[PDB]
């Protein structure tokens with residue numbers, strides 16, 4: 001039993017809600033919140049820009065030190081950093097950005113990072129400003145993640161379409 005509330009159950013291990021992931025994180029304070037990161041951990045917009053703003057830019061300061069030490073992530077890769085005021089940890093996961101020409105096949109690799117964590121709050125990888133089809137992202141999530149994932153979908157219209165079209 002966990003403290004996630006109001007989710008629709010899609011499968012044995014995947015749940016979905018129409019919610020602002022920032023507000024969800026502030027309420028639940030989960031062990032792991034997933035960020036829709038880029039390889040440079042530049043949290044300018046989308047989910048990443050919103051999560052960083054909620055940390056008063058502390059996520060960005062920590063991220064800049066991480067990159068200065070380690071260099072960029074791989075597309076499809078991840079790193080674990082602090083969750084600041086939002087969660088214990090933030091798993092920064094890089095899904096392919098279709099608006100940069102990146103291979104959508106890497107979306108499965110991106111979701112595989114979730115399997116290293118028993119429970120996660122997360123957005124749909126590569127959705128939104130990353131330019132991929134959120135319906136496809138949901139399918140890859142369900143077919144790849146085996147740990148317990150609570151998906152927050154900000155857009156109500158998109159949330160309704162994802163549920164109604166789910167197979």
Ligand SMILES: CC[C@@]1(O)CCN(c2ncnc3[nH]ccc23)C1
Pocket residue numbers: 019020021022046047050123124126127128129130134152153154155158
């Ligand atoms: C579906 C693809 C998105 O890029 C569009 C909206 N995104 C979010 N999802 C959940 N919580 C969020 N807070 C701020 C943005 C945001 C994901």
